[PDB]
Structure 1
Amino acid sequence: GNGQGRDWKMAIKRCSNVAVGVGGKSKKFGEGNFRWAIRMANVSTGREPGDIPETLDQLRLVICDLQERREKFGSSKEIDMAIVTLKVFAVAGLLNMTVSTAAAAENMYSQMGLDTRP
């Protein structure tokens, strides 16, 4: 609540277009949503609530971590969603990509060899 950033406001505004439901009709991301993901995923990774990086490396790292934990534990829609959120935001943010659906973004991150397994 002090300083602002280009990639920050640009990422959020763009994320609004991202289709979390995957289909191209409502159910898109946003400010509150993006926060709910990073916030939850943060605590899940035994990391303080003040986790707000600004590098594609930091994002891809958080994913691999949360994935590893959620993996050995099984699978959870909640945590799963948070992951896909940080993914689309990372690509559509750092890469300023126009992710049509959170699902597509995650597919690219993994397809490129960033996210462990599909």
Structure 2
Amino acid sequence: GQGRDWKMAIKRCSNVAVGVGGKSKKFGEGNFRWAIRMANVSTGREPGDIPETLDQLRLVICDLQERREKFGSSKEIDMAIVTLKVFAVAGLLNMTVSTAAAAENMYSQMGLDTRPSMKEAGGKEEGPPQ
């Protein structure tokens, strides 16, 4: 979460509004680091584990929504989930969305809330460490 791809994705997200205003503040880099870190700890991943691909990010979001379903919603888990969806849609897919609500809606319409099977995925991501 320090490379050129990370920063460009963050730059894309910086124009997205947190609230469905209007007047609303926009997302900042720290918001994404917080959301990833929160989701990582919550799902038993190493805290600094940055998703590199859309597939990896989708699985984190899936794990976190399943946690939300099992143990219940909260202002914090809800914010983490929507923040990750903004990262997927505006960051990784480079899609113009005005608000976090719009990203959430787009993420859902594209079918991304579905957790793909391992066979569906074709194969996990197995590559060199550096």
TM-score grouping bracket, smaller chain normalisation: 0.7 to 0.9
Given candidates 36, 39, 42, the residue that maps to 1:41 is 39
> What does the per-residue CA deviation read over 1:70-113, in whole Å, with 9 as the maximum and x for residues that have no partner?
11112111011111111111111121112211111111111221
Identity %: 100
* Distance in 2 (alpha carbons) for counterparts of 1:62 and 1:47: 9
CA spacing shift, 1:4–1:116, aligned 2, 3 Å: closer
Give a deviation string over 1:25-84, Cα, whole Å, max 9, x none: 232111111111111111111111121022111111111110001111121110111111
* Structure 2 CA distance for aligned equivalents of residues 39 and 71 of structure 1: 19
Task: Tell me, in whole angstroms, the C-alpha distance in 1 between the residues paired with 2:22 and 2:42.
Answer: 30
Structure 2 distance, partners of 1:93, 1:85, is: 11
Distance in 2 (alpha carbons) for counterparts of 1:50 and 1:19: 25
Distance in 2 between the 1:26 and 1:79 partners? 20
Residues 14-35 of structure 1, C-alpha deviations (whole Å, 9 max, x = no match): 2111111122323211111111
**Which of structures 1 and 2 has the bigger CA Rg?**
2
Contact kept? 1:56, 1:91, Cα under 8 Å: no
Hey, which bits of structure 1, 4+ residues long, moved more than 6 A?
none
Contact in 2 for aligned 1:11/1:96 (Cα 8 Å): yes
Separation in 1, partners of 2:92, 2:83: 14
Relative to structure 2, which stretch is displaced further, 6-15 or 81-90?
A: 6-15
Once the two structures are TM-superposed, the CA of residue 4 in structure 1 deviates from its matched residue by 4.8
Cα drift, residue 5 of structure 1: 3.1
**How far has the Cα of 1:116 moved from its partner?**
4.7
Q: Which protein has greater RCO, CA pairs closer than 8 Å, 6+ apart?
A: 1
Aligned to 1:24: 22
Instruction: Using structure 1 for the length normalisation, give the TM-score.
Output: 0.87
**Cα distance between partner residues in 2 of 1:26 and 1:77:** 17
Alignment gaps of 5+ in structure 1: none
Separation in 1, partners of 2:114, 2:49 = 22
